[PDB]
Each structure stands twice: as structure tokens, then as C-alpha cells.
Structure 1
Amino acid sequence: SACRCERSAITNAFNKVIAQTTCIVPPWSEATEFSDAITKVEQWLKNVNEIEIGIRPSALLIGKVWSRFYFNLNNVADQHKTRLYRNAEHGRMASQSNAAKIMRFNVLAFLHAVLVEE
């Protein structure tokens, strides 16, 4: 979202996030197919400069949106933990939670948090 509007600088931020950045434990502890993909990325970037220009964002909503998001994950990690059963793969049922059922309900978290306090 913090990028240019041309076809070049979009890939600069696009390719930057592809590489999984290195990370070490903090000391306080005890121890083709992308040529058309960037176009869709630029398609959304063609919108970020087209809609939010007339927005009026206060500082209360940013915390309110985050607080709704923060609490929502604290329930996903509490209920999907026990649902790693034998046949949880391809969770067509409800109690069968795979590594994607514990994951899909984290991105709808962002979508929901930006609607209740929106």
C-alpha cells in the first residue's frame, strides 16, 4: 500500500516480501506466473490511490479495529487447538480443523474487525 503507481516500483515491494526475512530469538527470552500476478497486485494498488483519498480516519478507530482483531485471534487459538483430530484434514465438517481452518478464520478476522468498528 505504501508504494508508487507505475509498473516498476510495484515489483520492488512485491519481490521484497517474497523472501522470508531472517529472524533470531530476542535476548530477553530464556533461550510466466508472476508477470500477470503483479498486475493484479497493481490492480489493488490502482485502487488504494482511488478510494481512501476521501477518508477521514480518527485515532480511536485504529485501536478499535485492532482491538476487535486482537481479541478475535485469542478465540481462534483457543478453540481450533483441540480440533486437530485424526481426520481433521480437508475439514468438510466443523469440528475437523486442519492447518487452514485455523488459518482461514484469521483473515476473516481482519475483514470483520474492519466492519464492526467501521
Structure 2
Amino acid sequence: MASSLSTVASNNLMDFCSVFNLIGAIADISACRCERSAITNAFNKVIAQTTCIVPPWSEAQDDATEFSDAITKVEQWLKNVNEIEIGIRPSALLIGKVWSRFYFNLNNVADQHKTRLYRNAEHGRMASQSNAAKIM
């Protein structure tokens, strides 16, 4: 959840939960395996260390080993990545097509959920009711 938080400062701080951040964290973590502290610097790389301004064109429990298991699994995952990814042959077309489907899919989801919030969407079971967890 920390990897999916972003703050934008425009007359009021705003908080979003972006899927784009997860792709960033996955891209950031798998950069290297040289150091163990790298895969914990990525979680808190941007969470509370910088602020972004509105673009100009706008019209207006020991608390020290909490990440001993999450780091451990991620560390073991990088072992698999370092071996499988050698035999990867991406193309200029493969990347183009995955974004076309991914972009179209997101735009449909954001439209069929703006009206399915209601009042009792918590514990959402029926497909006609949605909350901030189904959307993400």
C-alpha cells in the first residue's frame, strides 16, 4: 500500500492510489541485486521525501524488523528474475500491443464504477456494488 501512494500539492494536498506506481516500484526494485538495502529503499523512495506541484497549463512488533519477511520474499523473488529474464526477447510491437490493451482496459473500468458506490458498498459481494478495493 505504501508503494501505491502519491501526494500532489495544489492549494490542498491530495492523495491518490495509482496503479502506475506499482509498475514503478517493480521496475525500481528489479534494477539490481548488488545490495540488500536497495529493495527497502524502493518502498520509501518517494512516499514522504518529495512534493509535486500542479502543472503550469492547469486552468487553476519491534518496529525495526517489520519488513524482515517482505524483504525476504522479495529477495528470493529476485533469484528467479535473474535467471528467467535472460531468455526474454521483447519486440517493438509486443510493447506497443500490451499498452493498447492495458490502456483500453483501464478506461473501461473507471467508467463502470463511478456509479456503483452507493451507501452499503462495504463488504462488496454483488457485482452491482463496488468500493475502493474492487476498483484497485
TM class by shorter chain equals 0.7 to 0.9
Distance 1:20 1:62, change over 3 A: farther
- For residues 64-104 of structure 1, the C-alpha deviation after alignment (integer angstroms, 9 at most, x for no partner) is 1111110000000000111011111111111110111111x
Match of 1:62 among 95, 103, 113: 95
Distance in 2 (alpha carbons) for counterparts of 1:97 and 1:49: 38
**1:41 to 1:14, Cα distance in 2 relative to 1, 3 A:** farther
Q: Can you list the C-alpha shifts for 1:5-57, whole angstroms capped at 9, x where unaligned?
A: 44233333344255474211111111922022111122222222111111111
1:17–1:24 CA distance, 2 compared to 1 (3 A) = closer
Distance in 2 of aligned mates of 1:27 and 1:36: 43
User: How many residues end up aligned between the 2 structures?
Assistant: 103
Q: Which has a greater percent of strand?
A: 2
Any gaps of 5 or more consecutive residues in structure 1?
Answer: 104-118
Q: Provide the C-alpha distance between the structure 1 equivalents of 2:90 and 2:96, rounded to a whole number of angstroms.
A: 11
Q: Distance in 2 between matches of 1:77 and 1:9?
A: 34
SS in 2 for 1:73: helix
Q: What is the TM-score when the length of structure 2 is the normalising length?
A: 0.67
How far, CA to CA, are the matches of 1:25 and 1:65 in structure 2? Answer: 30
Which runs of 4 or more aligned residues in structure 1 lie more than 4 Å from their structure 2 counterparts after TM superposition? none
Could you state the TM-score of these two structures normalised by the residue count of structure 1?
0.76
Unmatched tracts of structure 2, length 5 or more: 1-29
- Does the aligned pair in 2 maintain the 1:5–1:45 contact within 8 Å? no
RCO comparison, higher one (Cα < 8 Å, 6+): 1
